[PDB]
Amino acid sequence: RKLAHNFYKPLAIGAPEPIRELPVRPERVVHFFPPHVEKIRARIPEVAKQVDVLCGNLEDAIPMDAKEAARNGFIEVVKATDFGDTALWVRVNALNSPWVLDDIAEIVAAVGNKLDVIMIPKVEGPWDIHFVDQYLALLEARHQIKKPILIHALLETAQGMVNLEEIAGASPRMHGFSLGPADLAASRGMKTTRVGGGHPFYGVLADPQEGQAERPFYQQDLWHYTIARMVDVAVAHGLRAFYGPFGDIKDEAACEAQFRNAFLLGCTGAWSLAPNQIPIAKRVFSPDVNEVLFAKRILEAMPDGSGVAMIDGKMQDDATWKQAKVIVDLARMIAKKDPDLAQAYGL
Amino acid sequence: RKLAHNFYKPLAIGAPEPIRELPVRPERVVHFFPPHVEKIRARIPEVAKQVDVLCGNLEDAIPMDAKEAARNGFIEVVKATDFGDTALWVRVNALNSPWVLDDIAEIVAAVGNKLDVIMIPKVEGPWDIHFVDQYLALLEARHQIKKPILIHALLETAQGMVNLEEIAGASPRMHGFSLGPADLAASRGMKTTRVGGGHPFYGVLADPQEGQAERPFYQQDLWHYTIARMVDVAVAHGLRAFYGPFGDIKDEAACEAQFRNAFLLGCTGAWSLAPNQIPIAKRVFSPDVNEVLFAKRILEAMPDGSGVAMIDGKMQDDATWKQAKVIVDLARMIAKKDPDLAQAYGL
Amino acid sequence: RKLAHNFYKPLAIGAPEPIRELPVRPERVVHFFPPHVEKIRARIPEVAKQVDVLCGNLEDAIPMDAKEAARNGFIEVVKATDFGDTALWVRVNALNSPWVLDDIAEIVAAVGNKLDVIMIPKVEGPWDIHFVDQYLALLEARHQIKKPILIHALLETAQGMVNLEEIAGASPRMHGFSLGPADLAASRGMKTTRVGGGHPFYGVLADPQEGQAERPFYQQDLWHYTIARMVDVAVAHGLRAFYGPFGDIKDEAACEAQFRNAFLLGCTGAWSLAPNQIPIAKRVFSPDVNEVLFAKRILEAMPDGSGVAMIDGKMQDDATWKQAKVIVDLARMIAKKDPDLAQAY
Amino acid sequence: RKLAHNFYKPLAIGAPEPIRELPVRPERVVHFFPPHVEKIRARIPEVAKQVDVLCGNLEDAIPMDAKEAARNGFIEVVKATDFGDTALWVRVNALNSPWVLDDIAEIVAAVGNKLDVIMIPKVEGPWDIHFVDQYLALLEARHQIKKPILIHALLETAQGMVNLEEIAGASPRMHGFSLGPADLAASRGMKTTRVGGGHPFYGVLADPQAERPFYQQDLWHYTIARMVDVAVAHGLRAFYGPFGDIKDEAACEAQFRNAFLLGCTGAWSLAPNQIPIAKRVFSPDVNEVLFAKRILEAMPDGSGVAMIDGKMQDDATWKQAKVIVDLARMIAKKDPDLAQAYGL
Amino acid sequence: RKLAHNFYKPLAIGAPEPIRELPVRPERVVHFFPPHVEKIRARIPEVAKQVDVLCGNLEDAIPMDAKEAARNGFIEVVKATDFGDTALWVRVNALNSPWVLDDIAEIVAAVGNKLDVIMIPKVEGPWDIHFVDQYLALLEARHQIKKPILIHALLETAQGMVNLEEIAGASPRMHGFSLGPADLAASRGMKTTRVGGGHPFYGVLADPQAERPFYQQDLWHYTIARMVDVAVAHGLRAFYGPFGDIKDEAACEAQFRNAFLLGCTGAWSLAPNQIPIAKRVFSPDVNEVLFAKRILEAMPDGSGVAMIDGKMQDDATWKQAKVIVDLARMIAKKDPDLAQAYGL
Numbered sequence A, B: 001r002k003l004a005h006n007f008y009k010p011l012a013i014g015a016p017e018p019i020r021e022l023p024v025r026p027e028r029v030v031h032f033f034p035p036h037v038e039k040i041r042a043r044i045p046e047v048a049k050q051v052d053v054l055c056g057n058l059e060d061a062i063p064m065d066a067k068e069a070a071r072n073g074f075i076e077v078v079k080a081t082d083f084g085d086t087a088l089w090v091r092v093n094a095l096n097s098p099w100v101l102d103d104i105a106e107i108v109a110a111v112g113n114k115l116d117v118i119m120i121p122k123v124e125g126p127w128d129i130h131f132v133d134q135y136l137a138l139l140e141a142r143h144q145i146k147k148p149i150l151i152h153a154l155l156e157t158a159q160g161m162v163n164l165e166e167i168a169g170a171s172p173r174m175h176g177f178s179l180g181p182a183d184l185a186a187s188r189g190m191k192t193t194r195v196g197g198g199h200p201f202y203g204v205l206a207d208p209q210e211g212q213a214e215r216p217f218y219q220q221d222l223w224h225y226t227i228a229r230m231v232d233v234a235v236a237h238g239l240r241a242f243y244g245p246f247g248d249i250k251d252e253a254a255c256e257a258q259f260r261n262a263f264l265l266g267c268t269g270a271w272s273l274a275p276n277q278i279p280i281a282k283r284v285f286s287p288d289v290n291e292v293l294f295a296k297r298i299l300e301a302m303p304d305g306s307g308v309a310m311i312d313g314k315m316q317d318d319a320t321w322k323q324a325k326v327i328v329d330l331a332r333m334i335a336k337k338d339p340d341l342a343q344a345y346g347l
Numbered sequence C: 001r002k003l004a005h006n007f008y009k010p011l012a013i014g015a016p017e018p019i020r021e022l023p024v025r026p027e028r029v030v031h032f033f034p035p036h037v038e039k040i041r042a043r044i045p046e047v048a049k050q051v052d053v054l055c056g057n058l059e060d061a062i063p064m065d066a067k068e069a070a071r072n073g074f075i076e077v078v079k080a081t082d083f084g085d086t087a088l089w090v091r092v093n094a095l096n097s098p099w100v101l102d103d104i105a106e107i108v109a110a111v112g113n114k115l116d117v118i119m120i121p122k123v124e125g126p127w128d129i130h131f132v133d134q135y136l137a138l139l140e141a142r143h144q145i146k147k148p149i150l151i152h153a154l155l156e157t158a159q160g161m162v163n164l165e166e167i168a169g170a171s172p173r174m175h176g177f178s179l180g181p182a183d184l185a186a187s188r189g190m191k192t193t194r195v196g197g198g199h200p201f202y203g204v205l206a207d208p209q210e211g212q213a214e215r216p217f218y219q220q221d222l223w224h225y226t227i228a229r230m231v232d233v234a235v236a237h238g239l240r241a242f243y244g245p246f247g248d249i250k251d252e253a254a255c256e257a258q259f260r261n262a263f264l265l266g267c268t269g270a271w272s273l274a275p276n277q278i279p280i281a282k283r284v285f286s287p288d289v290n291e292v293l294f295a296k297r298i299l300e301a302m303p304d305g306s307g308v309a310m311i312d313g314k315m316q317d318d319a320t321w322k323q324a325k326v327i328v329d330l331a332r333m334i335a336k337k338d339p340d341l342a343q344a345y
Numbered sequence D, E: 001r002k003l004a005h006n007f008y009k010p011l012a013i014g015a016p017e018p019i020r021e022l023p024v025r026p027e028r029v030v031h032f033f034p035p036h037v038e039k040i041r042a043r044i045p046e047v048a049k050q051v052d053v054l055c056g057n058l059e060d061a062i063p064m065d066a067k068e069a070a071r072n073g074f075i076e077v078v079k080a081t082d083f084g085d086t087a088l089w090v091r092v093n094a095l096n097s098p099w100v101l102d103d104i105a106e107i108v109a110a111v112g113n114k115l116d117v118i119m120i121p122k123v124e125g126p127w128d129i130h131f132v133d134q135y136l137a138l139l140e141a142r143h144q145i146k147k148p149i150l151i152h153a154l155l156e157t158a159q160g161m162v163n164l165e166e167i168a169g170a171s172p173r174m175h176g177f178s179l180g181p182a183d184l185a186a187s188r189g190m191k192t193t194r195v196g197g198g199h200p201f202y203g204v205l206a207d208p209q210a211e212r213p214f215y216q217q218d219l220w221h222y223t224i225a226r227m228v229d230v231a232v233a234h235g236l237r238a239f240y241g242p243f244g245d246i247k248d249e250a251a252c253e254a255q256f257r258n259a260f261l262l263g264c265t266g267a268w269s270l271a272p273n274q275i276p277i278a279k280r281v282f283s284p285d286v287n288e289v290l291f292a293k294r295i296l297e298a299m300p301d302g303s304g305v306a307m308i309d310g311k312m313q314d315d316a317t318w319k320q321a322k323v324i325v326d327l328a329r330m331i332a333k334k335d336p337d338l339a340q341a342y343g344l
């Protein structure tokens, strides 16, 4: 790992100074779109208004022959639009691919000053970050980019999971991680073709019952370990953790349950793959109204944030005050964008 | 990490020789109390007789205007009391706080010889342990303290979780870890104000059954990964793992369930925050009666702990013998201290 | 770790060149047997035809006074048998035991060319692998063994769990890990005498219900973290992860459930401790017929594996194609060996 | 090592923000003095005028029965003296000693805002730094100290040498290292009672031909070379410590000059007579500066190639010249007598 | 590294408890001998009384057809000889060799209770130590060896040099290192066939003035310095190995003395004539001892400052004096002339 004094130095003469703190903004939903699709490209300004984060996709789900068209279409649509409060991301192709050199180079060259975050897929170790870091720096210097483009690592290989700490601390550009359950399941050899959510085969069988009686089967979460480890490593490095894609577009109930699990565990947001998933992500990664109301009571009960208090037979202290603050701070930020939430939150 | 031949050397001339083995004693319940509260302080010698471990608290839940009074109150009651077989701990203030230097110094000066374990909150890395170890050594030398004061690390930050191995191996003073789910939730940004236990928002949704409305929702353990990792790292380093606080004081059913989960995963004990939680912790972290009996039958079927056997259609061998021995060894040392459990097992 | 340019060098003059890739073969079931039992030994050649892997056991479950007999028994049944497609493993005694030196030396001497994998119990760190690697190499050189004997590490100590990465990367002999739930519980101090499976005491209690209706209690998986970590570390190092023993031989339903959880999480196979467990492991650690069918639909929807597609409301792309490929490739591989799975798949 | 974003955070609420860059100042000579000696103490403000750095000594060479007197003496003289451009250091007792807790606490409490650097003796590993860093932070917060007190590690154990990288990166307080050849020789078991300098027993015998030449070798080459690399790689400074033979000024100067050539910033003086030796040696030689100027002139933009007296110059030799000239320039503004000799 | 609480545990049930501290004894000379050569084997009990350490050699210099003869010869002479206070070592064959398994197993089985130290050649990393440590434990348990056989690592590969720290901390059996300049030169590709000592081609050419002076340099400075630091940091001892030029005793003494100065405990002797050279060189010089006694007498408690012969002394030089005088006492305890020479 790099020395702290060198960690914050630009990797190229003319490259912008590395940031010390991550930009604070709502990131409840990261909306993916295929930039090579004209009808979708046409409604981008409309969509951008309704999402915290917009992410152009160049990698998986983009057909091999459409790669160049996706890259160009992203550049085309970005040059045309003012995204305002909406964050702009892009997932370029893999580091071993014949498209990645031009993806990064041409995008930075054209719209580098509008690009907030670049997502790198199939990350396996800190060496991957080292390349992207130095490559971006040289491109930023060449094209006079005013602020550093951040790196978001898609967490979707067994290697990536094992090397998570090393990846997280590899660069000041690091923004966070997205769990990619599809590639990760394939890499691990998890015997499923689903993308997130539960699986009926994973459960605990109860002991034999009093008199022959049928045995309850309790489904378990496939992703507990993975999300928990991702959150810990990310947060410890000052980064953010995201749930990635939920593949079953039509099963909105399961999407919500999976999103909510991630939110509870400490994830900032999730991807949306279609318009229907957009309100699900925003609704889930906004704190529940009852959570906020009770949190406000904790903050009020201990105004200085120090000491002890009892609310409804539940003990409160300095720590629960900090828990409440996390919820309320987030709720406050969001309430500025959604009138109805502000009304519900009273913030 | 220090070399083995230096690891066991005292860090100050006149400081007592570092321990090679942790003291063997029941630690089923760690009872917290606020030392600045006269009404509670007056009953302390009475409470001490009913707990395996008594722990004064100077950190969170103590109002900032009562910090010095709490420190003084703790010292006062300790000086006046013979704790007998009851272990004495204290949770001092955080390493970044204006109270910590005096917390440790005054407690060692006045009652260092009575103090078994010091609990350090908000631990982030091995550097924290290094400071406390060297500080304790110099204070022990200063006051001719006869046995080393051990260090118990409160596990309640994201950095602490990630650096757990390095923390565990940083000192021969290390006693173990307590899970602090309130600060840990806040640190990770887990979206709850609860302190331990289940959450109705975290669960797995069953698949949609065509023609049926009900989709079972199976609640999941928020703390599986956390406790499992804590237990592995602690035990691998010869240390003990504990569950910390259960915040919902009145929900004794949920408290017992949370305590029992920790016990099953290998935790030695849990904190009690009020008298009602004392019998719960003692009951849970004492091996259950039929568990002991079946273990006793395993030890009988293989007197030397070597070979194979079947009991009730269940295969037994050297390893299940070791499993039984763990349960039976624990039952014995509790029975020596607890009269009611002495007869419930066999003594 | 050793340097890459030394990692693949033999540790003794005359020892065979280290493998670069793990041998590809079905390993759905690892059948354990006590080699000192003549009755069982006589049936071994028959049993071997039904299992992917046969593993002789010299360690736990073998009485002290039978250690020598078990070692000789294993050697003798191996000398007399052509196992064919069945892989041959042996679990020797622990590295601190008075039997391990002779276990490894005598087995290599007599049947080293027939032994595929040696299982080492109670592994604690990379130092354990370093000893076995170097000892095996000198024995291989001594008896001119033609291919490297692989090391399978039993994962059954807290130290082993914590040092898993180092153990995994310690030798080119590494084959994989088996979860040893019994010793691991005893090592951790998990308060149970059960060997795998659920425990009724481990669950999440629901919130107070309303008019104080009984509070639902949801049992949890004791082994989730353990198996998940084993799978990640193994696969990242190019190794395979296995569920070990399920101690309740009579409870076939709980056995199958435990086996299936391991399979879902990425485990390659499980142990069988008795013949009744053999078909359970083979059934579970083969992809379910419905899994394969939907997987085939995915592969068919975009044969080059590059693009996007919708199937039954579920979105598909390059990654789900790779998921399907994992399932289909394993399906075909087993089908060529397990006749029922050819027509069915 | 700590994470970068946490590395630069104060370790106590109210402690001053950790520095990102080391203060720039001449540090050619670090003058040691026993603060418990009244006659020395009385002469302190005069001696301070002619040294770059003044360092009070509480550790070795201070008798056990004088430890507290030394502590109080240091505090007394510091409170009463305006040191000006002279940096103020103190070498406290070892981390295992019965004096160190009070050494650090009482000095920080009384004169922390005047203390630039604290020297810790017999450092063995990063854990030592972690303790001092956290201790200082809490003391700094308690007494509202305005700037961070830096940590200078005495390199004088074999363990410290082996753990040099870990020590160097342990804290943003790190200032640098001093070689303590006496303790280091004893730690290693180097069979000499000398403190720095050469030893006639260390040398290479030529092949037979008559009379075989015996070439003396530098005992300290490896040690100083390693110290400089580790120090410089971490943005720290490396120092030669004491030269024990106070009277042998020729050998002192030779040892000092070796350290300076290898990259050391300065050396200790243990007596007034060593003061001008250190200042002379750790200031660039006049001919070194002159030739460096020739290089800077032949390379007005610092890039390209050139030839001076059969010696090839380029971007790198320009940087070498810049190191020389920049140092000469900084010293010149502090020393008028060197300004015209240098021509700066 | 292993955890501290497991580091000191026997690796086999029945193996003796690992040592916490190295045995204290003179180890100035490590005398090598080919145990297969009969006429040498008959003089062993005589030579044994004249050396601090006797080391049988089974590896390099022993021809292949004599490997088994060497092993058997070692066992035979050890069985018959009471070595008294002379240490008994054996250098077995390399870990990749067809001889090592039996070298270790048979020797432990036959004379394990007389064997103090086993030397492992061609060590490349901690994995080598791990194997030998575990192998020995299982052999010790089987044959009921009462005290642990220690491991001495021959430092003679580039990889060994680089992994020195990991090797040093790999086992409580570790005794120390010997520099093997022959294999190390071949391993590094140092362009010479000499075994230790100087080389006329390695030197520094002075600037033009007259004929330019050429100062020969020590090939082994870095190597020995690094070995000493790593060894001592882990509480181990460093040794110089073979000086291959048996007849050039002056060059041998010079090489040996360089090692002694840098901190090496002893050296190997390959022939009878090297025995007195090693014993002489690795015993403290009389003047070193006499001067070290004055420092100890000047500061009886080892605290404070003093002044002798214009040389300043303090706690640190007292410690240096202590290193020298302690060693002298041990040697004087079995050598009357040095006792009277040293005046103890």
Ligand SMILES: CCC(=O)SCCNC(=O)CCNC(=O)[C@H](O)C(C)(C)COP(=O)(O)OP(=O)(O)OC[C@H]1O[C@@H](n2cnc3c(N)ncnc32)[C@H](O)[C@@H]1OP(=O)(O)O
Residues within 6 Å of the ligand: A032, A033, A034, A039, A040, A047, A057, A060, A061, A180, A182, A183, A195, A245, A247, A272, A273, A274, A275, C308, C309, C310, C315, C317, C319, C320
């Ligand atoms: C598993 C590992 C991974 O890599 S997941 C990440 C990669 N995946 C993606 O980005 C997938 C994005 N989604 C899509 O491409 C489309 O949703 C696909 C799957 C092709 C479906 O196309 P289509 O059949 O037109 O959907 P539809 O009839 O339901 O759409 C209705 C209207 O919505 C639009 N729409 C659809 N998706 C998006 C989107 N991501 N962003 C913006 N608009 C979208 C459609 O174009 C359609 O628009 P309109 O009503 O016709 O104007």
Ligand SMILES: CCC(=O)SCCNC(=O)CCNC(=O)[C@H](O)C(C)(C)COP(=O)(O)OP(=O)(O)OC[C@H]1O[C@@H](n2cnc3c(N)ncnc32)[C@H](O)[C@@H]1OP(=O)(O)O
Residues within 6 Å of the ligand: A308, A310, A315, A317, A319, A320, B032, B033, B034, B039, B040, B043, B047, B057, B060, B061, B182, B183, B195, B245, B247, B272, B273, B274, B275
């Ligand atoms: C979550 C993050 C954390 O840091 S948790 C760890 C820090 N927290 C603590 O230590 C909390 C300690 N507990 C307390 O201060 C009290 O229990 C609080 C929370 C204030 C509740 O007080 P109270 O409402 O009086 O409880 P209660 O009604 O159950 O009291 C019954 C009787 O027992 C006493 N009591 C109470 N707590 C303790 C205690 N910890 N130790 C000893 N005695 C205790 C009460 O004084 C009361 O006495 P009585 O019935 O009036 O004779």
Ligand SMILES: CCC(=O)SCCNC(=O)CCNC(=O)[C@H](O)C(C)(C)COP(=O)(O)OP(=O)(O)OC[C@H]1O[C@@H](n2cnc3c(N)ncnc32)[C@H](O)[C@@H]1OP(=O)(O)O
Residues within 6 Å of the ligand: B308, B310, B315, B317, B319, B320, C032, C033, C034, C039, C040, C043, C047, C057, C060, C061, C182, C183, C195, C245, C247, C249, C272, C273, C274, C275, C276
């Ligand atoms: C938990 C920690 C660990 O170390 S577990 C790994 C170590 N344990 C083992 O290897 C256990 C091996 N298994 C056994 O010893 C037996 O199966 C035990 C468990 C004792 C049960 O014996 P039993 O009750 O007779 O089994 P069964 O009724 O099912 O016998 C049916 C026929 O099959 C035979 N059989 C039994 N076990 C095996 C075996 N492992 N391999 C091959 N054959 C086996 C029985 O002898 C019986 O034979 P048959 O019909 O009479 O010809």
Ligand SMILES: CCC(=O)SCCNC(=O)CCNC(=O)[C@H](O)C(C)(C)COP(=O)(O)OP(=O)(O)OC[C@H]1O[C@@H](n2cnc3c(N)ncnc32)[C@H](O)[C@@H]1OP(=O)(O)O
Residues within 6 Å of the ligand: D032, D033, D034, D039, D040, D047, D057, D060, D061, D182, D183, D195, D242, D244, D269, D270, D271, D272, D273, E305, E307, E312, E314, E316, E317
């Ligand atoms: C080797 C391992 C280590 O720890 S070295 C670092 C620790 N040692 C030290 O700090 C040594 C400091 N020096 C001293 O104590 C003295 O210089 C000692 C060694 C005692 C020698 O005294 P002396 O013979 O009087 O020296 P000298 O002839 O050069 O003195 C001439 C006049 O100079 C004065 N002087 C001496 N040292 C200092 C000093 N460090 N700072 C200021 N003034 C000093 C002396 O007082 C002396 O005049 P006077 O007749 O002593 O009054």
Ligand SMILES: CCC(=O)SCCNC(=O)CCNC(=O)[C@H](O)C(C)(C)COP(=O)(O)OP(=O)(O)OC[C@H]1O[C@@H](n2cnc3c(N)ncnc32)[C@H](O)[C@@H]1OP(=O)(O)O
Residues within 6 Å of the ligand: E032, E033, E034, E039, E040, E043, E047, E057, E060, E061, E182, E183, E195, E242, E244, E269, E270, E271, E272
């Ligand atoms: C360079 C890399 C390495 O591996 S060095 C470490 C391995 N080398 C060794 O151990 C070499 C040991 N030495 C020897 O074998 C001999 O000294 C060699 C070099 C072969 C020369 O033998 P030779 O010429 O017969 O010796 P010499 O005439 O000088 O001896 C006179 C009397 O001394 C004897 N001697 C000789 N060497 C030893 C010895 N190492 N130990 C005991 N005795 C030795 C000779 O036998 C001779 O005795 P005697 O007069 O016949 O009773």
Ligand SMILES: O=C([O-])C(=O)[O-]
Residues within 6 Å of the ligand: A060, A121, A154, A156, A179, A180, A181, A182, A183, A184, A195, A244, A245, C319
């Ligand atoms: O790309 C992804 O997000 C995946 O593989 O799940």
Ligand SMILES: O=C([O-])C(=O)[O-]
Residues within 6 Å of the ligand: A319, B060, B121, B154, B156, B179, B180, B181, B182, B183, B184, B195, B244, B245
């Ligand atoms: O301090 C604690 O125990 C916590 O935060 O849960």
Ligand SMILES: O=C([O-])C(=O)[O-]
Residues within 6 Å of the ligand: B319, C060, C154, C156, C179, C180, C181, C182, C183, C184, C195, C244, C245
């Ligand atoms: O040996 C085993 O497999 C175990 O202990 O579970």
Ligand SMILES: O=C([O-])C(=O)[O-]
Residues within 6 Å of the ligand: D060, D156, D179, D180, D181, D182, D183, D184, D195, D241, D242, E316
């Ligand atoms: O203190 C010192 O500088 C020494 O020991 O050389």
Ligand SMILES: O=C([O-])C(=O)[O-]
Residues within 6 Å of the ligand: E060, E154, E156, E179, E180, E181, E182, E183, E184, E195, E241, E242
């Ligand atoms: O074996 C040795 O000592 C050598 O190679 O120099």
Ligand SMILES: [Mg+2]
Residues within 6 Å of the ligand: A060, A121, A156, A180, A182, A183, A184, C319
């Ligand atoms: Mg993917």
Ligand SMILES: [Mg+2]
Residues within 6 Å of the ligand: A319, B060, B121, B156, B180, B182, B183
């Ligand atoms: Mg807390």
Ligand SMILES: [Mg+2]
Residues within 6 Å of the ligand: B319, C060, C121, C156, C180, C182, C183
């Ligand atoms: Mg086992």
Ligand SMILES: [Mg+2]
Residues within 6 Å of the ligand: D060, D121, D156, D180, D182, D183, E316
């Ligand atoms: Mg010193």
Ligand SMILES: [Mg+2]
Residues within 6 Å of the ligand: E060, E121, E156, E180, E182, E183
């Ligand atoms: Mg050699």
